[PDB]
Amino acid sequence: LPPVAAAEALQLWYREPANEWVEALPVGNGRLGAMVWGGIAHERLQLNEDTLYAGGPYDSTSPDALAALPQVRALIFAGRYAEAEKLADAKLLSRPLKQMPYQPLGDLLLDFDRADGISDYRRQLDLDTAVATTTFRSGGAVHRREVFVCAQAQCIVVRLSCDRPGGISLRVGIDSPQTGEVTAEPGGLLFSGRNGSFAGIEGRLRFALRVLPQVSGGKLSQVRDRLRIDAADEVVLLLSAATSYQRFDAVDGDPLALTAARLRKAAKLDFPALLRAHLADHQRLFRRVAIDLGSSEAVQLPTDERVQRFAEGNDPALAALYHQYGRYLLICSSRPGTQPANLQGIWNDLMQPPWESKYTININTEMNYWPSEANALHECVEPLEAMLFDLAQTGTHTARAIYDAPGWVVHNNTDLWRQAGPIDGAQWSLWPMGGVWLLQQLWDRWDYGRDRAYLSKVYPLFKGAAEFFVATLMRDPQTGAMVTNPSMSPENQHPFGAAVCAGPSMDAQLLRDLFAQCIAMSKLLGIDAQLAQQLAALREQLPPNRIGKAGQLQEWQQDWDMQAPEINHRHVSHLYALHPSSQINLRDTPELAAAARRSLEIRGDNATGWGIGWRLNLWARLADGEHAYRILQLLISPERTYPNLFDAHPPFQIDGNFGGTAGITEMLLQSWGGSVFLLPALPKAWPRGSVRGLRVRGGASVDLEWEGGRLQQARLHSDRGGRYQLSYAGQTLDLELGAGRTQQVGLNNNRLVT
Amino acid sequence: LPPVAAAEALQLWYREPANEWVEALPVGNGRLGAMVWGGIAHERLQLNEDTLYAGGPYDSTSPDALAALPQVRALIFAGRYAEAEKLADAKLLSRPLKQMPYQPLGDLLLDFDRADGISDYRRQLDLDTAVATTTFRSGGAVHRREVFVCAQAQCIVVRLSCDRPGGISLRVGIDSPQTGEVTAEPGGLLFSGRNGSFAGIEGRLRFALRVLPQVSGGKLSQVRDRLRIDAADEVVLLLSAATSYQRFDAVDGDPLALTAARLRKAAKLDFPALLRAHLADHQRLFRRVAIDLGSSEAVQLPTDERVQRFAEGNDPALAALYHQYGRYLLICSSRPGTQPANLQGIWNDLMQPPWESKYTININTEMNYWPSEANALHECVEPLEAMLFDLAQTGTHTARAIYDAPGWVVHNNTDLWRQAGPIDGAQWSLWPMGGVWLLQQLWDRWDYGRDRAYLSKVYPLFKGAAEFFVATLMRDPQTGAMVTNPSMSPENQHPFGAAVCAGPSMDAQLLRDLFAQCIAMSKLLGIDLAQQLAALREQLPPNRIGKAGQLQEWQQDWDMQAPEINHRHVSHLYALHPSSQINLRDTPELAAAARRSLEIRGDNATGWGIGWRLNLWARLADGEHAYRILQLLISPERTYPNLFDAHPPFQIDGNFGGTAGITEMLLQSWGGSVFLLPALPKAWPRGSVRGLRVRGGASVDLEWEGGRLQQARLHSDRGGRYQLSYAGQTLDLELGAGRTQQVGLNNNRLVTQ
Ligand SMILES: [Ca+2]
């Protein structure tokens, strides 16, 4: 488990305390999170538990939906999309119109009674240790505060230290926008309460937050709702949190007992022993991947200045830091047994956050988990798998209540209560492909891990999704294909006064992949030979990929792209086949790839943080390193990245962080088809470097080293053996490896050889 | 009544919220204060009430002091100084050794529900309005928060505004290191408790802090110990506070009822009515004086950067801003009926502040009130006069119990409980001149105002001080003068292993002024005996010039053999400033000797030490040396980003000494004369000043250009004779009551106009 870079190269640091939330630094263990401001005399730690949402179990299905569905479908086939959207909002959409928001737990307040003559201030976050440290000089003493969240102890650990005796004096309190009661003793604090209502859905959750002090020296007392510590030698605060949430339909947990159990269990330990356990668990996952894109003197600059000055072309390491920040954030927001990374990971200080900070699944949640497999963090996918089994249940209800159809269906959003209906507005959400796109991540887990028992476990999910579309696909009267109706291209207006339509190109691409996967699983598992044969015939009937009058790949069945209202729409939904899919690629479909390149050129480069991140991956797939680097400059910029390196929609949306990590990876290594492509989109700004521990499909890992803009060496390690193909700059090399063996590759007189 | 500068020329402003206490901005009405951090989503207002100290009434007098006093005196006359100090600490010093500290009331916590996409941030403090304003843009809406403390309604007013409807959502809490309990209703908050003990003295004070919300729109609720406001159009918070303190021996007040009566009275008014009343009261005092030292583009810079760049010589207006900051701080920390400005004014967030944040009267509290008269703020002296009336009572007990002498005496420190004995250590505190030096401010009140009824009121204080020294002065067996014993020169070690000695030069200068004042008041009031004060005054140790041409700090020529040649105190220069006992005109030789003493000491010291040297060089009519001192004072080494003076740490004395020194450079009033631009530096080639007060009941307006006097206007309030002096040229004038005389230059001659 060797380190993956120099200690300096993986730290975010600043010369001043934070003035805004988007300057505070995040720590987390997958389910318990904290934002650290680094205050000197008055410090605030803003906390989250990843099951604290408003409301309770509910059913937003509209009882009017199934009745009005045939008329919406007939209006769309008649080309009266504005009337169909109006009718859909009236009768089809969910009631209530909104889903439930992710909400903050509270803030830990640390108020020291003196801070005289401050010098040499530094607050930092070390990605290798997941510790937020604040340090300064006061008088003759060095004062230090360290915060981290351990997945083993399931506690936030806060240590207040000073290199002179009797220098820790403060009070400790809890502040929260949630209702409840705080009880305070010398022995510690407890904050117990219930969540609130939202959109008429009453709050049925209970929560508990506990604060336990461990004081060496001084006096420990209690005043009002706060702990008081006078002239102590060292203080360690341990914090645990939980809710009563058990399932989307079950809220009978005991957060009071669970938090107390974790505290007394963890209180039996010593801080060096606490630290060794946290470092071991965190570093077993973080140190799996090492990346080096170059080093400069700019590594000495504080992180905020690096973001402001990255456009100077003199700080290659900031791209590598951004890459590892996404791997870090996925580790800290999505561990096995926790909730999936929502729109903000787990970090949120707003009771009514933007778009409820839930799971928007017409691009954003998918982008969150894009970097998982290639960056050796497939265990972080477990929450998505668990959520998808939940959506199999609720989505079955939705499929039968809205469409009177078998199988299961999900639209463009879901929350902690796993609702699967369309919400907000038909022009954004009347889109039945949410489950299909989320399932693409599970297919990658099969294709990367090749665990046959896993495929057996996840196949019923793919079957049920296929069954829904077998029953819902319709013959299109203008084109003659089997299409979806009602649907939409997220989230674009077509040239005829609405967004709803029949068989948008994204639906055809998603179902082409879904049906191919169901057929391949039927052969690999020896079941459902029939239905797989009919999925093949139904697959041929889907709307085909088409090239329009401007040489562009068509977003809709009809050649509408050049007369669409917003030519630079942030969504590029019809380019899904070029990325994240490889259905369209430069090798196997050169014409359609050139048409997708033309469509991407017509859309333009600038958009939201996630829109920029999607364009980064697309240009990486097109093997254009210089354009991909130009997109990366737009992503890592004062317009789209906060001083704490958070991605900006704006405001903060964690999707762009994960998409940027995946796009940087895609520029250096790609794995699709039967091949592995080496440095397909390497930009001139990265002439030398290395990457180690990347994963490819077929159960293998790759290490890469390059110099002068040219490949120097690569190592392919196969776990169980198999045949592979390496491709570099148009040259291919067919290999065969045994289980647990390594094949080194290199360049000899400009030829790719072993 | 008209403004005294452009609005932007008298504001402190910054691009970012404060990270430390010394970056927060102060507001106050004399007794109720707030330090404003300017936080965006999480703001703190740190609060103070100027009667909240630790402890309670006590008597620190040592019962072993009188018995050991004759041996301390004989040991000093025998030149055994170290042993006298040790015996004094053992038997003479106060018990407990320390006095009580000034302590913070608590913090108001304003935690808002949104701060999305923040731009255009600015936090500021306007000296002309005494309002701390923080503004920024969120999305397309403008958010603003304003804080001020009104002296009429006796309330802190906090206004949370936004230019879009329903944009104010937050919670309001109270956090304090003081004990007590907070109760919470939708109708408001109350924090009631008792103070704590210090140095064995129990806490006998009770305090109350009330918060009254006034919410336009939205929903007003209470959760836990906090108020909750959701989606309001506008929020005004009213805050009142008080203690049970009544005087040094009475702690039976009713702060619970006082704060409630102030709140319900103020709640009957509108915010424009509240603001109008506050603006009228504050600007009635602040706008009396205008100063203009020049301008430049540097006025556009944030105040923190201006302090860092003042040495570049391109920001002359910073000195004028610093000068008016001192006038602002006195107005906001010392109004009639309030406590005097302590070591930190009224602003303090520490339970155990440096040197208890009390009243050190061997330079510091005097420096606080130096700028009062010339800058037209004599009303701010009332708390000092009130404290001096207290000290005549407790100082009488101290005089009888320590010295078995009549009259009253105070040493070098006092607190809210008005103790008058020596504390901490004999090498710093064994010094009986505290009340004598504080009385000099009261004489300036007489000399500036000439109110005869005021002289009758304050005369008993001057008589009582003279009576104590008539009874304690002793014949020095080595020198033959009448000297103080035991005493010291604050707080310098002499060449013989201690600081205690007999008849230090400062004591002789203070008593020469005190005896001349008591004699002159005897002739003005036709009472009393002044005959013996005249003979006793003639016996005091004279002003002497030593071997180095220096004014001697002690009776003997010891200056060149002292351990610390650059001591922060210049106590024996008191006669040159703040007194005029020695000056360039009447005592040329002694004035040149004080310059030599000042040159040997050097220019660098604490913030207050630099401020004293600034006034001293101003009195020596040396503009360039005075300006060199000012560059030491207004610098990153001695001034915080909020313009607070640095000892270090924060000590308000330097601010007031800086305001006084800048004034002394431009206008001086002593002797029978008024000196115009006596210490003008080349850095201020043109400018003006109006509304300054001079002795004899008159005011002066001044204008200069090209480094030379352009015009001066002398207005006499009730008539009298005056003499103006400019660059050694004099002009004798006689003005009637309420009349004005303009003077100017003609062929480099001071003439009338
Ligand atoms: Ca999670």
Ligand SMILES: [Ca+2]
């Ligand atoms: Ca006061």
